[PDB]
């Protein structure tokens, strides 16, 4: 259809949602998920070590 | 007047040929992807990754064509 | 070069490294250079050409088998 | 209300443009000429949906627990691991940017497409009668300007990473020498690889635009042409298919973004 | 054309679409979430058994 | 006013080429799906999933073509 | 004179391309079906049930073009 | 006069496209039927049954195109 | 002019497309015939009987266009 | 009068399409003939008979087309 | 004037379609000949004989086309 | 005037053919890529390099067509 | 002026169709040559010689078309 | 006038059909090249030579068609 200035206004909205997401959203969620994964992995690892 | 008659036909040719090209290219590629998935299940995710790698390249020119046909239809005519 | 083994049900018929071979595979004459992709096929009775490292050709007669 | 079906279908394809020369609303019957006329309906629904995404994810990222997760936390972490695996499957660099970029792309484009499912004339009717606005169309991804906006952002990332991760020297070598590998063919090589570089972002944006535009345009047609007592038997079998389309057209955007950024550096 | 009739037909079609959704699209999502919480509980159960 | 008949032809060509593309792409794809089922008949519900995942792409451009042809044939004409 | 004539030309092109599309697509699909029936005949009642599902999708889009060609010929005259 | 003289050309287009579509579809289908009959010669009467089953679906769209082409030539023009 | 010359063009289209279809379909079908005859050099009569069975159906619908093109040229023009 | 050129155009179309079909169908059939002959190199006197048996059918409609093209060119025009 | 001008196009179509048919048919047949040669290199002098035997049949019609094209371009011009 | 109406049609045909060509060529090339990965997926990183090496040439000309089509549509207009 | 504007289209049809035919025929033949050479690297020169022998047959008619298209475009203008 | 716009139409036909040919034939050839490389990964440098050998004759005619398209377009 018709190109518009909106292609420029939307580039502001895009970049800003990527920075706030990158900083606040992603790092903590991945931190929590990895914190669960590590605990179960190493707990069972300790379990099989003591068994032997 | 004389404009819209021919401009609609131009967009029509453009997007018809785009539809032929993208449909046939993806049909072949997906047929090979499905034979590969039937051959070796448990690789479905990796083959699907590669399938999208290629499908992204297949549809480029057809999608420029679709975009410019819609441009002609709703911008010029 | 790669390692070729020709073995019967009874005795070993050959071994060692090889540059290439030519077999008359079931679906047609065939040639296996190094690094060849994994292949499995029956082969028709006849001679199998070997060229041992340093180009020493020799023919073995094979009544048939699976390559 | 003298709506001829060819005219009702017309009004629905009208954006609610505001002119930046005088901050005035561009009426549908005469379209002013200028590049300075923001489409307001979409940018709102776009910033609003990105805000809704970010708020939903933040009200959990600030609380997520490593015990047995709640039924809502679980839904978010599911998509988190999904995007994270799609990234790990197609990217090995150390950049912290790629994963959140792909997450935002996937969820935001998915929400924008989701608008396509609602009854076409609900929000437009409320927007005309209750508020008074002349026109409204509520699908952000069914408009050119937003889609290529994201494509050009990802294009600038393509260039940034292509320069950073192999320097101007390797970049200029790749552009010129390939694909014919001889310095005789350099002149032509620049055209092919040059546009082929240009082809990626343009095609990225148009893949989403065309699909969402022409999936909306159907609801406008089914709505206008068929009598009320016949609309459902052709409408619902279309929405059941667009539920697949809206998912695939966001997932492909995410995947191709990841691919262009990872194949650029490595 | 009457515009009210169109708003009637769209409402009918949207009701029908929601009724499809509830009975084919929503149950799978809740099943996935429930099965991932089952999995996570078991995996925490694994660490509890390992301490035992 | 001669305008109309030509627009009907422009819609006819769009929908015809779209029909060819979307029919042959899905035919090629479904042929591979079926030969895959014949080999691993218990996997059918998984290959149906992959087949519907891929078929949504074959019908990307052909369905846009159908939409715009049906539009021109009615909305414009 | 030539207004009503050309409508028939557009219906002709539309239905001709729709016929090629559906014909070739179901030809390929049924060819792969027959091959799967040949390789495992005791499995035919299942491959047929999957064949009809796929065939429904294949011809689906040629058949609205068939409907619109019949519309153009008779209804629009 | 041009009006019906061109209807003759319209029927020509329609049923020529129908002819090639049905011919190639049945050719592929029959080629696969013969390969099946060659792999399991004890099975021919069953595979031929299935072949006739699906060949009715193949030509179904071609056959109405043939009917309408003949109509346009004899009835209309 | 317009009366006689176009009818020859309609016959030309009819009997060119009929030629395309009736040639390529039988080429495809006979390729599998000759492959079966190379796999089972005893069955050749049975497979050629099946080949004619199917080939009658293959060639039938082109022959409608063939007779109709001869009609258009001689009977009409 | 100008009419005479469209007759040459019609014969050009008709004979070109007949040449396309008569070339490609026999190309396929002969490709399979050779593929079968490489397997059983002693069955050439038999496969080469079956080859002509089928090839007689391929070229028939193309031969009708070619003869009518020659008639249109020299006799009528 | 057009009696001169159009004829160059009417031979253009003839010698385009002749070239496509001959090139594609001989490409297929020579490809099959080559794969036969690679598998049975000893049979090369036999498969070459049979290849030349068959090529003269595919080359049959395309040379009618090309000779009539040369005639029309130079003889009637 | 007629200039722009015809120039849009020229660009439309050029980009349409370009899209068909590039899409189907990359579709075939990618189908072969995917089958070669399906047999052994550790050569994915290597086959996926040779794939781009060849796709760069497959899509050489089609972008010459796109490049000039865009020129005609936006520069000659 | 009025005369010359159509001879460039007469050349265009010849050379577009000849480029398609020659390109695709040599593509097939070279693909089979590369397959046979990938089976047997030792026969590569013999297969190359047979390839070049058949390839001369491949592009004969296409090259007649190229010569005549260049003639028309630069000698008849 | 009517003269020039038809020149661009013929140039477009030439340069589109040349694109069809040069894409489809090199796709058909490169597919076989790739599977052969996946088969004899050591002979890749050997097979790529023959691949270019044949690629040249594949491109033979499409390049003449392209040059005449550019001629008709800009040089007349």
Residue numbers in the entry:
A (entry chain X), E (entry chain Y): 1 to 52
B (entry chain J), F (entry chain L), G (entry chain Q), H (entry chain I), I (entry chain P), J (entry chain O), ...: 3 to 79
C (entry chain H): 3 to 69
D (entry chain a): 4 to 269
N (entry chain R): 3 to 78
Which statements did the authors publish about this structure?
Focused classification of rotational State 1 highlighted five sub-classes, here termed Sub-states 1A, 1B, 1C, 1D, and 1E; with resolutions of 3.1, 3.3, 3.1, 3.2, and 3.3 Å, respectively. The defining theme of these sub-states was flexing of the central and peripheral stalks, with the majority of the flexibility seen in the peripheral stalk which bends and twists, together with minor movements within the central stalk. Independently, the movements seen between Sub-states 1B-E do not facilitate rotation of the c10 ring and instead illustrate torsional flexing of the entire complex. Sub-state 1A was in one rotational sub-state (here termed Sub-state 1’), whereas Sub-states 1B-E were rotated by a single c subunit relative to Sub-state 1’ (here termed Sub-state 1”). In State 1 the un-stretched spring corresponds to an Fo rotation angle in-between two of its 10 preferred rotational sub-states. The maps presented here were generated from material imaged in the presence of 10 mM MgADP and all showed the enzyme in the “autoinhibited” state, with the C-terminal domain of the ε subunit (εCTD) in the “up” inhibited position interacting with the F1 catalytic subunits. In the cryo-EM maps of the intact F1Fo enzyme in the presence of 10 mM MgADP, all α subunits contained ATP and Mg2+, whereas the contents of the β subunits varied: β1 bound ADP, Mg2+ and Pi, β2 bound only ADP, and β3 bound ADP and Mg2+.
